[PDB]
Design a protein around this nucleic acid. Structure first.
Ligand code: NA
Ligand code: NA
Ligand SMILES: [Zn+2]
Ligand SMILES: [Zn+2]
Ligand SMILES: [Zn+2]
Ligand SMILES: [Zn+2]
Lengths: 162, 162
DNA sequence: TTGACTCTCTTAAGAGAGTCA
DNA sequence: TTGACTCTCTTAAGAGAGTCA
């Protein structure tokens, strides 16, 4: 809601409900050829999802609570960061999945950062492969790799130089 | 529609016009604390842009040629790759700026790959910092670094485990 | 045949708010 | 009050197509 004590109450009930979502074990690449284990708290695939949760998109959800007879609603993954600044250097803060598992709501698998910082983790080498993120990645990005480039830099004539 | 010889002629006229665009020398990071130099052929900021060129967006342009009475138009950066497959792994190929300078049309600074591969280069450490792209980067991605995370993984109670 | 404009669309990481029961 | 749906928007990497002289 509006008060400091009201926010904390929204965060506590949120944690409480998410703490009951089924816990699924996921083995993941860490970089450097090493492997780790993550434990995600995943929102169900279909209703009911849990007290206060409703699906607004294939993989989008919202959490809502009635405070003083006035209902408040937030993005399902933003609740843990309700007391932090909502922007940085003029950029909007977003909930970033360190586990790269959208259905997961485990706050130990989320961070609060710019959309650019958020996206970038998709290509990070991982905690054991070279990650330089101040708030370290939990795993190697699912998109990290050599890529599959169809054609590289090229010219037919002689008008350009690198 | 167009024959292979006709497409080649289109690539030749594109190179001839782009080659006359102002050439700007840029000093850039290559990773490993090393500094490099890139020479970008930049399309003007306002009309006229050059024979066959027209702006369709703040930072988007198109190239068009009329052959045998029929008008042909392509994205301005896609021309160098008109003789290559247009998709890979069920994904559409896109023009990727190795120099991260949108206005640049230097073909020696572009590659043809999926949008995901394309985006990823924004966070690459660079050719001298550990880049693993099969078609190597020309410089360090502008977004590579520790980031500016506002809040990290946290919980108030004890319902969660990593 | 050309130049200088106009418009909306794609992706995959993310969001906001309204309609019913 | 709480649940289950519906709709469109944001961003920064990229696109196709129309009008008019
Ligand atoms: Na993310
Ligand atoms: Na790019
Ligand atoms: Zn998770
Ligand atoms: Zn990282
Ligand atoms: Zn360039
Ligand atoms: Zn690279």
């Amino acid at each position: 809601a509006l008060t400091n004590a009201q926010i904390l109450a929204v965060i506590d009930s949120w944690e409480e409900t998410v703490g009951q979502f089924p816990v699924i074990t996921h083995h993941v690449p860490l970089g450097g050829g090493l492997q780790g284990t993550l434990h995600c708290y995943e929102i169900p695939l279909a209703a009911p999802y849990g007290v206060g949760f409703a699906k607004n998109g294939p993989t989008r959800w919202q959490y809502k609570r009635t405070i003083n007879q006035v209902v408040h609603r937030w993005g399902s993954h933003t609740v843990p960061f309700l007391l932090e600044p909502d922007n940085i250097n003029g950029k909007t803060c977003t909930a970033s999945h360190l586990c790269h598992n959208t259905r997961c709501h485990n706050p130990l698998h989320l961070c609060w950062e710019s959309l650019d910082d958020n996206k970038g983790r998709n290509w990070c080498p991982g905690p054991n492969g070279g990650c330089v993120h101040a708030v370290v990645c939990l795993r190697q990005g699912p998109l990290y790799g050599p890529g599959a480039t169809v054609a590289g830099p090229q010219q037919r004539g002689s008008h350009f130089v690198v």
